Design an enzyme around this catalytic site. Sequence first.
Site, PDB file in Angstrom:
ATOM      1  N   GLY A 130     -64.860 -18.401 136.905  1.00  0.00           N
ATOM      2  CA  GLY A 130     -63.306 -17.820 137.510  1.00  0.00           C
ATOM      3  C   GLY A 130     -62.502 -19.174 137.486  1.00  0.00           C
ATOM      4  CD  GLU A 143     -44.724 -27.866 137.752  1.00  0.00           C
ATOM      5  OE1 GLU A 143     -45.615 -27.451 137.289  1.00  0.00           O
ATOM      6  OE2 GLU A 143     -43.563 -28.418 137.027  1.00  0.00           O
TER       7      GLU A 143
HETATM    8  C1  LIG Z   1     -56.828 -16.520 141.896  1.00  0.00           C
HETATM    9  C2  LIG Z   1     -57.772 -15.374 142.114  1.00  0.00           C
HETATM   10  N1  LIG Z   1     -57.809 -14.485 140.977  1.00  0.00           N
HETATM   11  C3  LIG Z   1     -58.823 -13.354 141.249  1.00  0.00           C
HETATM   12  C4  LIG Z   1     -59.508 -13.528 142.321  1.00  0.00           C
HETATM   13  C5  LIG Z   1     -60.438 -12.215 142.442  1.00  0.00           C
HETATM   14  N2  LIG Z   1     -62.100 -12.834 141.820  1.00  0.00           N
HETATM   15  C6  LIG Z   1     -62.959 -13.240 143.060  1.00  0.00           C
HETATM   16  S1  LIG Z   1     -64.446 -13.675 142.311  1.00  0.00           S
HETATM   17  C7  LIG Z   1     -63.847 -13.320 140.942  1.00  0.00           C
HETATM   18  C8  LIG Z   1     -64.696 -13.367 139.776  1.00  0.00           C
HETATM   19  C9  LIG Z   1     -64.809 -14.625 139.077  1.00  0.00           C
HETATM   20  O1  LIG Z   1     -65.871 -14.673 138.488  1.00  0.00           O
HETATM   21  P1  LIG Z   1     -67.060 -16.001 138.759  1.00  0.00           P
HETATM   22  O2  LIG Z   1     -66.033 -16.868 139.344  1.00  0.00           O
HETATM   23  O3  LIG Z   1     -67.699 -16.125 137.575  1.00  0.00           O
HETATM   24  O4  LIG Z   1     -67.752 -15.417 140.044  1.00  0.00           O
HETATM   25  P2  LIG Z   1     -69.450 -15.188 140.037  1.00  0.00           P
HETATM   26  O5  LIG Z   1     -69.220 -13.666 139.706  1.00  0.00           O
HETATM   27  O6  LIG Z   1     -70.334 -15.607 138.861  1.00  0.00           O
HETATM   28  O7  LIG Z   1     -70.168 -15.253 141.413  1.00  0.00           O
HETATM   29  C10 LIG Z   1     -62.256 -12.735 140.834  1.00  0.00           C
HETATM   30  C11 LIG Z   1     -61.815 -12.402 139.489  1.00  0.00           C
HETATM   31  C12 LIG Z   1     -59.751 -14.322 143.299  1.00  0.00           C
HETATM   32  N3  LIG Z   1     -60.436 -14.563 144.238  1.00  0.00           N
HETATM   33  N4  LIG Z   1     -58.697 -15.427 143.016  1.00  0.00           N
HETATM   34  C1  LIG Z   2     -42.712 -25.986 135.062  1.00  0.00           C
HETATM   35  C2  LIG Z   2     -41.993 -27.158 134.510  1.00  0.00           C
HETATM   36  N1  LIG Z   2     -41.981 -28.191 135.281  1.00  0.00           N
HETATM   37  C3  LIG Z   2     -40.951 -29.299 135.214  1.00  0.00           C
HETATM   38  C4  LIG Z   2     -40.064 -29.121 134.261  1.00  0.00           C
HETATM   39  C5  LIG Z   2     -39.068 -30.331 134.271  1.00  0.00           C
HETATM   40  N2  LIG Z   2     -39.132 -30.929 132.842  1.00  0.00           N
HETATM   41  C6  LIG Z   2     -38.452 -30.479 131.770  1.00  0.00           C
HETATM   42  S1  LIG Z   2     -38.842 -31.509 130.478  1.00  0.00           S
HETATM   43  C7  LIG Z   2     -39.991 -32.277 131.256  1.00  0.00           C
HETATM   44  C8  LIG Z   2     -40.838 -33.110 130.323  1.00  0.00           C
HETATM   45  C9  LIG Z   2     -42.011 -32.356 129.437  1.00  0.00           C
HETATM   46  O1  LIG Z   2     -41.931 -33.589 128.666  1.00  0.00           O
HETATM   47  P1  LIG Z   2     -42.304 -33.202 127.050  1.00  0.00           P
HETATM   48  O2  LIG Z   2     -42.532 -31.827 127.110  1.00  0.00           O
HETATM   49  O3  LIG Z   2     -43.254 -34.235 126.520  1.00  0.00           O
HETATM   50  O4  LIG Z   2     -40.899 -33.187 126.266  1.00  0.00           O
HETATM   51  P2  LIG Z   2     -40.346 -34.198 125.443  1.00  0.00           P
HETATM   52  O5  LIG Z   2     -39.696 -35.503 126.429  1.00  0.00           O
HETATM   53  O6  LIG Z   2     -41.491 -35.246 124.512  1.00  0.00           O
HETATM   54  O7  LIG Z   2     -39.048 -33.742 124.827  1.00  0.00           O
HETATM   55  C10 LIG Z   2     -40.171 -31.750 132.378  1.00  0.00           C
HETATM   56  C11 LIG Z   2     -41.116 -32.578 133.407  1.00  0.00           C
HETATM   57  C12 LIG Z   2     -39.703 -27.791 133.666  1.00  0.00           C
HETATM   58  N3  LIG Z   2     -38.755 -27.514 132.656  1.00  0.00           N
HETATM   59  N4  LIG Z   2     -40.695 -26.776 133.930  1.00  0.00           N
END
Ligand SMILES: Cc1ncc(C[n+]2csc(CCOP(=O)(O)OP(=O)(O)O)c2C)c(N)n1
Ligand SMILES: Cc1ncc(C[n+]2csc(CCOP(=O)(O)OP(=O)(O)O)c2C)c(N)n1
EC number: 2.2.1.1
Lengths: 676, 676
Positions: free
Chosen positions: A155, A414
């Site tokens: 996961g 981010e």
């Molecule tokens: C961001 C996020 N999405 C969904 C869940 C719900 N969730 C908990 S365990 C799990 C299964 C992930 O499977 P895995 O990590 O392979 O655990 P395993 O069954 O092998 O112990 C999910 C979907 C969570 N806890 N966090």
């Molecule tokens: C989620 C997100 N994070 C940050 C930005 C700000 N941002 C716009 S373009 C860029 C640079 C990404 O560089 P690249 O995709 O290589 O574009 P290029 O300079 O080569 O045109 C960033 C950090 C954004 N638009 N969206």
Amino acid sequence: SSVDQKAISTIRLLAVDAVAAANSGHPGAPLGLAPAAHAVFKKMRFNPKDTKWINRDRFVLSNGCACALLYSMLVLYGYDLTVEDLKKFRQLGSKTPGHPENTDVPGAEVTTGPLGQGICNGVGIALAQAQFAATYNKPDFPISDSYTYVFLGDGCLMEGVSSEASSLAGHLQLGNLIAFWDDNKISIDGSTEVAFTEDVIARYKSYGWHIVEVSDADTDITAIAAAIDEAKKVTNKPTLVRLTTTIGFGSLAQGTHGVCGAPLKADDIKQLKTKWGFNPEESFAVPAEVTASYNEHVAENQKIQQQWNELFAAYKQKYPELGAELQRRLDGKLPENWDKALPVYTPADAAVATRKLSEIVLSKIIPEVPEIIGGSADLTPSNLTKAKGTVDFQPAATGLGDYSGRYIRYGVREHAMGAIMNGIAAFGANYKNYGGTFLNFVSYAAGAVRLSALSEFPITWVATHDSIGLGEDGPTHQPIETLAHFRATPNISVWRPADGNETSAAYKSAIESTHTPHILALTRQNLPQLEGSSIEKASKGGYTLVQQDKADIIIVATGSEVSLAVDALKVLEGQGIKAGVVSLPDQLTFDKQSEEYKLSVLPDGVPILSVEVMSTFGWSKYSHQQFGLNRFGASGKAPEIFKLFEFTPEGVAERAAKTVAFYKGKDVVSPLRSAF
Amino acid sequence: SSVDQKAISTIRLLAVDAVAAANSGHPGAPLGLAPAAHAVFKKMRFNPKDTKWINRDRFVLSNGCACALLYSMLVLYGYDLTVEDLKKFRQLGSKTPGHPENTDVPGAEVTTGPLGQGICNGVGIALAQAQFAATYNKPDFPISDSYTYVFLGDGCLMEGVSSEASSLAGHLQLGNLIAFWDDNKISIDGSTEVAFTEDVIARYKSYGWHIVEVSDADTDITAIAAAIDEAKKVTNKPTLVRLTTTIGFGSLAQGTHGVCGAPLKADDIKQLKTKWGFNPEESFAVPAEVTASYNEHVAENQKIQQQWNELFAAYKQKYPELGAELQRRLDGKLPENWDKALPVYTPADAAVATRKLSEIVLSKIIPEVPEIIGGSADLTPSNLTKAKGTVDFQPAATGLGDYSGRYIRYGVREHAMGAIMNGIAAFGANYKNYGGTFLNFVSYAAGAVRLSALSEFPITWVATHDSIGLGEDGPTHQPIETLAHFRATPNISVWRPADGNETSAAYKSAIESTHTPHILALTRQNLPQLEGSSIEKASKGGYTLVQQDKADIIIVATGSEVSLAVDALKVLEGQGIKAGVVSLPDQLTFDKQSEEYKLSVLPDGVPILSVEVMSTFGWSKYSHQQFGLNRFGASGKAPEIFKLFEFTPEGVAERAAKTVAFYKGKDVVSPLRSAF
Ligand SMILES: Cc1ncc(C[n+]2csc(CCOP(=O)(O)OP(=O)(O)O)c2C)c(N)n1
Ligand SMILES: Cc1ncc(C[n+]2csc(CCOP(=O)(O)OP(=O)(O)O)c2C)c(N)n1
Ligand SMILES: O=C(CO)[C@@H](O)[C@H](O)COP(=O)(O)O
Ligand SMILES: O=C(CO)[C@@H](O)[C@H](O)COP(=O)(O)O
Ligand SMILES: [Ca+2]
Ligand SMILES: [Ca+2]
């Protein structure tokens, strides 16, 4: 050996019994990972009686739903967690919550459960360790040489945040990070063949990780220990250890998704115990031979810590300046009077964007507070988060930085930057670390930001381009909901400083913080220095900027809208209306003030209008009427957008006048009053 | 050829001139990608005069800041976008916003700019195309055989969401997806050597993608076209085409991060034009030979669409049932009276969790509405999002499903599931698609959810385990801020149904939606069938469940707290207090009702108390006092958590009584009243 096998069985059965007592929780991964947990903890240096020893190895359970396994390890090693606590697994108020919480669980470095977070936290712990060691280690003085051990599942490997952090960790050559993949071919929906068929190993090799594969991690603890030894030889790559396990190993339902997250049947638990030599009529059994074996390792670790303490004392003799700095940080104390470095402004100074004021603050305080490090998610020249003359955190082999550097190039990552920041704070040593992006894209990292609040980590988001004030990039870039979201999250300080003094107050709060994450919402556009602002007043979170005894209305505003509110006051004067202005740079800090202080800012008997160019949610805590922006923005020159939405001195004055008229002949009490 | 070169120069210079006129925007990637954009659009089938032709190839600019390039292509091909619109690039109200918006820009399939989103949208478009084709294509009737072309940059490749979607797209063998990586070794912070040194190609091979490398994508449009041809031969893998380009190609500042996102200097623009044969004194030049060449391709595409229309007519003759279904969907119309399949409940029916009511709704409406497809992010057995007897969307080669399947195994990939859902909706053909996870982890997908709202896509989140009501998993899993966040986002319907009838109303809204994304907040725990609920009343978003003429107080509640409010009413009766109950299953739907309807639910002259076990933000729109949960939750049996926080009939009654006392002898007007 016989005692190793018995320890592994003890762990497995404690976990299963904990889930059984709660009739809730996840027994499958604890069963599959107990051999690896046994082997890893035997290799780890830690002191159950001093969870804060700064040269401890760290362990992170990224697959936090397996926490019955973590709790079992902590109980067996004599952390401040007992078998009685295990018996209260998932029970209200217990020290064994359903997912591990660093605030509640001794020996839990971070709060995990939301998948993907822990491994990124581990990258941050390992990043901090590398930076810490580069800062303090000297010949014959290995002050910091610890490892970061992470368990994760399929996961976590599916969650994008772990890809981000793993790419970056490979780039950063973080050789003291050792992660273990529970390769059990099962997730909640069933076999991983239905959704997760990528070549994980090839992917990790593409990030520059080292790989060790353990084909029988159900039993081969020798190979698991050897994989740790191998990983430690590879000092310029993080390692992924592929643990091929059977989920629920031993259970009648082993290797099925049903063993993932439901208590085992009683008869299953009976045959588990009998096959491993335990009493099927007994729960929470702890063979004393396992306790003893584990206590031997603890005693050895405590002697290592004792010698470390003497190494530190000798360090302070040889390197008095560094030694005193290190002691200060381990005491949790900032440098004395560090805040005298905060810039201070007067109303005669020029207008400045609060992103630029932020740059200036960092340029003054970074040289004064060595435990500040931070970075940007590929927006360094827009967030203005690097102080000239600092060096980037990079493995020296790249030629692009050094591990002693203080500025992190997170790339366009981010979410992982958020969770890595949590790991840097989790390392300790008073790290006060920050991460820059545009405010609107802090939302990409919400999963981690929420855990900063829940974990009580003093991380700081430097969140520029906070509003329609950014202009042309348009509504895909302009926050509307963002402050409301994070202000509605418990324990986030959301500073939106209006000017230079307020920006210094915001950083004073963010750096002094020990238990509260901060988001600093900063402008692209220039703002004037305000008459009436100061670090002292803004440090109260909300304060009376313009006091008007005999006010017909008080306008409460934040950030860029404080100057707007002051300009509206002048329009209103011409309309025969007397206004006061309140600046509310942080609602959380303000909330924590005394009731009498808060009533001095938001008194009874006067209508209060809020002005902030995004969601009006939350603002009724502080106002009677709210002037906000509850629609998406627009792509244009920022002053024209403000005009379009009537965030002008005249538009604010118009709504203030309507508010005065609305309450004419009504009794008005402070918005701070509540029925309960 | 000479005209190809001239077209590429025209594109480059239109983009540069657009940025110059705005004195804002990003010229570097448009310069570097114009050869590829020229080559790809020449291979694409599309009709500028019918942007909705369902068998069009789709193009997605994932690196949305390069949109001067997209707008230039659309202008040159004679979409409803002119040179005059380009001249208004990034200007308030223009059709050429700073990042492309599907609602404002003809020929923009999706809204991009937030990095990572577009490529995931492309995966969703390609997923829909595969599903659509498998559903409708017959021998001699290739109703659907279109491709999905995506441009993306390093930034998109760093964002975790693209890793999620690329893993899943490789798993799904989506051979009609062709993505192009702008491999220009530069991002905003500088060289990609500082943060992004992974072997991208090896990673994509690890996902099961095909690779084509174009070593000189600045000039080799023959190789770019050949890479498309090659990709189309590989019918069981999505392809990544590595375009090695110079960012800002031609500029004096080519290959530097400064060309990324700032207007070029005037003298730079002059030498660009002179070196390529254009007039340096002229802006927005469009050589008629380029228009003509492009018009030839349009005419050919329009003849392909004309033949497609005849193929469709012949299809309806041969396959009357499928043909009528397809026509209905292309008309944007649900099946007549489909909603007669919605389950209806009475107060005599048993208590049911709203997650289970949701399962039952899906089980009834999926057979009736073929354009419903959806999935879960590895929580199928917990969200209850699959209808028994449906088959999973899988390439048939796996043996695990078929492309005609209707249930998607997203894996633990919430963010990409969000953005893929946007791409499925973007495909059109009336797709009404949904994605399940726990409500708390919808937050992992905030970047995409916000774009669902901004893009006006009718996607549906099936968001179970909505509160502390889930119990033992604890505060890492329990929403507090989540509804407030999404309710504060413009254009999200956030349904929190209280019982069976309300859950049917919620799905009626979500499926009928054409411009508004829905989040359905559903319970783990059982809830009673309410006296007074119906699909009809709940379809108003808020409604009077228990009418009490002579009310001393009205309690407004949602979801699981509606039953609590009704139980509190009975406690209050014993205390001599008469309460009414309002159920507010969707605040947005309620907001859209007439002012008179809303005042009939929330009248003047009576205090109103809200009850919902998470953030009180937003609730002052509807109440005078708010009883919510503004702290994180707890790990324990759910009824004990509710008791701890006094969300009990007695705790609600106590706060209702305090509210009545608070307003004793005050004049109370509806919270719906505003000064402006
Ligand atoms: C961001 C996020 N999405 C969904 C869940 C719900 N969730 C908990 S365990 C799990 C299964 C992930 O499977 P895995 O990590 O392979 O655990 P395993 O069954 O092998 O112990 C999910 C979907 C969570 N806890 N966090
Ligand atoms: C989620 C997100 N994070 C940050 C930005 C700000 N941002 C716009 S373009 C860029 C640079 C990404 O560089 P690249 O995709 O290589 O574009 P290029 O300079 O080569 O045109 C960033 C950090 C954004 N638009 N969206
Ligand atoms: O626009 C974006 C994000 O797409 C960045 O390229 C920055 O917006 C650069 O502009 P400044 O606001 O820093 O001047
Ligand atoms: O707990 C988690 C997430 O960590 C899942 O394993 C589900 O919570 C399974 O339990 P139900 O609530 O569906 O019964
Ligand atoms: Ca697994
Ligand atoms: Ca790039």
